Design a protein around this nucleic acid. Structure first.
Ligand SMILES: Nc1ncnc2c1ncn2[C@@H]1O[C@H](CSCC[C@H](N)C(=O)O)[C@@H](O)[C@H]1O
Length: 327
DNA sequence: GATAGCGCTATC
DNA sequence: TGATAGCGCTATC
């Protein structure tokens, strides 16, 4: 994550819904905002959240009386996506895990926050031809908020990962927020190879497999893109190998394949999966953040998490706009 | 709870 | 197209 000196969000209070690892907190907090409430029903996730922020998130948001949610200026929420991902049964709103947005809508209706910050996968935009997004746009407009949606890729904001996500920023209409913008992209000056751990610490993750084919030669020069070198087995999800000289593929939560949730990378003639912390970094997390003890849960957590760095640039601009109140 | 084979589907 | 991908889904122990 990036260090920020102009705390645009100072004095503001925010809510951390669907917290998971707490990435949204890390972001807004770096900009001077204050976290007043957090919600996350997964046991193990609460464990890491606690492990890193003291408190322990509250349970099932679908059964929390919104009247109970603390006063707050910005509502943060990266809601479930198994329901809209390019990688699943796009059952959208029909899927139980795909209704959570409306839970948000009723948190917003009651607490009427100044800003509504949401995150989800790229597919969300076009899912169901584009009606799902539309339902969210109108629901927000009908709640009297503006709707600023755009998809950004992590590799355009200082982090080596081809992770494209849809970011939705909502300002209450009262305030005439009309100068808000999404961070402009910029040169990628860091690659997988730069975030790795010494072989001394990865040995255990190396996977030698006879069925390891090799369809592309290692690259010498770094690229702001993921480059597939080899493959194992049938070459499906988590069976693909990439050049650490480029950028990492998207991390996933319920992912499979021998290189489950991280993907295979070629390091010094060997083929292996990333380390819980190599992920942490790949996701923009400061090495000072304590990961969950259960490696599996760890990978799962960073899987649906958010790239801290990205949220920062957005969070910064949210404040920039909020703080512009001329006479 | 931890593993791992997979079987579509975005997109260009 | 033909090649690459994906906050996923499942079964098995
Ligand atoms: N009803 C519910 N109540 C609380 N959390 C829920 C929930 N349904 C899903 N979730 C949680 O939704 C989260 C979506 S992933 C969001 C990740 C988060 N922005 C981060 O940075 O870690 C998951 O952690 C999942 O456990």
């Amino acid at each position: 994550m990036i260090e920020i000196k102009d705390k645009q969000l100072t004095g503001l209070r925010f809510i951390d819904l669907f917290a998971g690892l707490g990435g949204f907190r890390l972001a807004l907090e770096s900009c001077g905002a204050e976290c007043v409430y957090s919600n996350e029903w997964d046991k193990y996730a609460q464990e890491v959240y606690e492990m890193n922020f003291g408190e322990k998130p509250e349970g099932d948001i679908t059964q929390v009386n919104e009247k109970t949610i603390p006063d707050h200026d910005i509502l943060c929420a990266g809601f479930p996506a198994q329901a809209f991902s390019i990688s699943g049964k796009q059952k959208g709103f029909e899927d139980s895990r795909g209704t959570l947005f409306f839970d948000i809508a009723r948190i917003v209706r009651e607490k009427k926050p100044k800003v509504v910050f949401m995150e989800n996968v790229k597919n969300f935009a076009s899912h169901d031809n584009g009606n799902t997004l539309e339902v969210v746009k109108n629901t927000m407009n009908e709640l009297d908020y503006s709707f600023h949606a755009k998809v950004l890729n992590a590799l355009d904001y200082g982090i080596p990962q081809k992770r494209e996500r849809i970011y939705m920023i909502c300002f209450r209409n009262d305030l005439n927020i009309q100068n808000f913008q999404f961070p402009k992209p910029f040169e990628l000056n860091t690659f997988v190879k730069d975030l790795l751990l010494p072989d001394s610490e990865v040995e255990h993750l190396v996977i030698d497999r006879k069925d390891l084919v090799m369809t592309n030669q290692e690259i010498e020069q770094t690229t702001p893109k993921t480059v597939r070198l080899g493959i194992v087995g049938k070459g499906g999800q988590g069976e693909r190998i990439y050049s650490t000289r480029g950028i990492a593929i998207t991390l996933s939560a319920y992912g499979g394949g021998i290189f489950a949730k991280t993907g295979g990378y070629l390091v010094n003639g060997k083929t292996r999966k990333l380390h819980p912390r190599e992920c942490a970094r790949v996701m923009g997390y400061p090495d000072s953040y304590k990961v969950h003890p259960s490696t599996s849960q760890a990978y799962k957590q960073f899987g649906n998490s958010v790239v801290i760095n990205v949220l920062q640039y957005i969070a910064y601009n949210i404040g920039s706009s909020l703080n512009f109140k001329p006479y």
